[PDB]
Ligand binder design. Sequence first.
Ligand SMILES: O=C(O)/C=C/c1cccc(OCc2cccc(CC(=O)O)c2)c1
Ligand code: NA
Ligand SMILES: [Zn+2]
Length: 258
Amino acid sequence: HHWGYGKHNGPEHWHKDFPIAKGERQSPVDIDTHTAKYDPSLKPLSVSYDQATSLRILNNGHAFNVEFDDSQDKAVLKGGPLDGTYRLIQFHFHWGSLDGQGSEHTVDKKKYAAELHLVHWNTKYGDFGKAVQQPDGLAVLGIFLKVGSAKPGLQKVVDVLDSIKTKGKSADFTNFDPRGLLPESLDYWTYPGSLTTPPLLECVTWIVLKEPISVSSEQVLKFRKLNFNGEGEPEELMVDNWRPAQPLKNRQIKASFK
Ligand SMILES: O=C(O)/C=C/c1cccc(OCc2cccc(CC(=O)O)c2)c1
Ligand code: NA
Ligand SMILES: [Zn+2]
């Protein structure tokens, strides 16, 4: 599987190997803020990252993943639209070549410079691989990034990217606190969707925060120095690793806030 983000292997090609690309609950989507409806039934959202145990950061040729020890209930997401407990397994970002693009979700068609995905799996299914086979297997917390003031909690990530420039490189990344990547408000939109990369499985409850975080131009410029290619291969900058908005079809986006 040689999927990627280029002209010949990018999102418009994915459906040939992954026909669910044209399915009924694909992600990302445009969030039309005027059509999203407040749902007074949503329970409070609970992000409990105090005992999070990061392990490693990996360039997988598509993005970089900060991985967590998910062998115990440490860092979990509960409440909101969710039933039960979802354990953090990894986070990663999608970003652009320019500050005007990079996010996967859009808000009233606005693209942000980047989008953070904190990926969690439903502990009722025992492991991530079983969870992705279920319609309620994953919860992905999505957070927009805009360019402005630096995000101090991001800088440790930024500073290790030089050591994982190319596809397949990993580095120790212990003691990283993902609480430093969250905005002040947990107001959110939620809808049922999919993974935004192959295999595009329709197993995700999306929770997209309304408040973006700000990162500096210098921080995102360092994301853009990463490579899609492996070591010793021709350089292809890791930029524009985002899937565009997909048809909403038979879905409603719910808001947690008035
Ligand atoms: O290597 C293989 O053959 C199968 C890989 C595989 C098999 C099953 C699942 C799966 O999920 C990958 C994943 C995890 C989290 C998020 C996303 C989409 C995104 O970039 O936001 C994709 C990957
Ligand atoms: Na717009
Ligand atoms: Zn993602």
